[PDB]
């Protein structure tokens, strides 16, 4: 049950949002900080870029547009008018040790994940997810 009119609404709003962002003097990175400080909806420059270029899914774009439009209408209306975990950086040295563990055994037990996280001074959950994503990558690249 696809709606052509919804795609048009998104195309139009994408074009006019970029237009009006620029006219207000905001970079893509500026929009993303304004939405965090003001509304709690922190968003990266990457995500604003994808939204303006329509390079998000239809569902993701639909969910962001009202959050973007609210920001824009406020920023243009000045006549006296919980949060995602930060993306953990994994340095090349750590990645290489995890890769070696993965080649040894691509599915460490929970006890083994604990040992690894302690060895590398990491949180158990980050190591757990690293192995999940690495197993997924192995399926993706050998499809």
């Amino acid at each position: 049950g696809d709606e052509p009119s919804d795609l048009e609404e998104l195309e139009k709003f994408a074009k006019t949002f970029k237009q009006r962002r620029i006219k207000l003097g905001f970079t893509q990175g500026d929009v993303g900080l304004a939405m965090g400080k003001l509304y709690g909806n922190d968003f990266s420059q990457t995500t604003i870029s994808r939204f303006e270029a329509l390079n998000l899914s239809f569902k993701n774009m639909c969910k962001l547009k009202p959050l973007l439009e609210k920001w824009l209408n406020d920023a243009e209306s000045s006549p006296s008018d919980r949060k995602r975990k930060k993306r953990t950086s994994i340095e090349t040295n750590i990645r290489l040790t995890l890769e070696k563990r993965f080649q040894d055994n691509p599915k460490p037990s929970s006890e083994e994940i604990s040992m690894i996280a302690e060895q590398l001074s990491m949180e158990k959950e980050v190591v757990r997810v690293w192995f999940c994503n690495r197993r997924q990558k192995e399926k993706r690249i050998n499809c």
Binding site: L10, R50, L54, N55, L56, S57, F58, K137, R140, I141
Partner: peptide, 26 residues
């Protein structure tokens, strides 16, 4: 062979708009 290593948005609004434009002109 250069294989894409990471995850991608499989179907974008951009592509859906091109695809509606392919079906209308039909």
């Amino acid at each position: 062979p250069k294989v894409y290593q990471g995850v991608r948005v499989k179907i974008t609004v951009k592509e859906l708009l091109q695809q509606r434009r392919a079906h209308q002109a039909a």
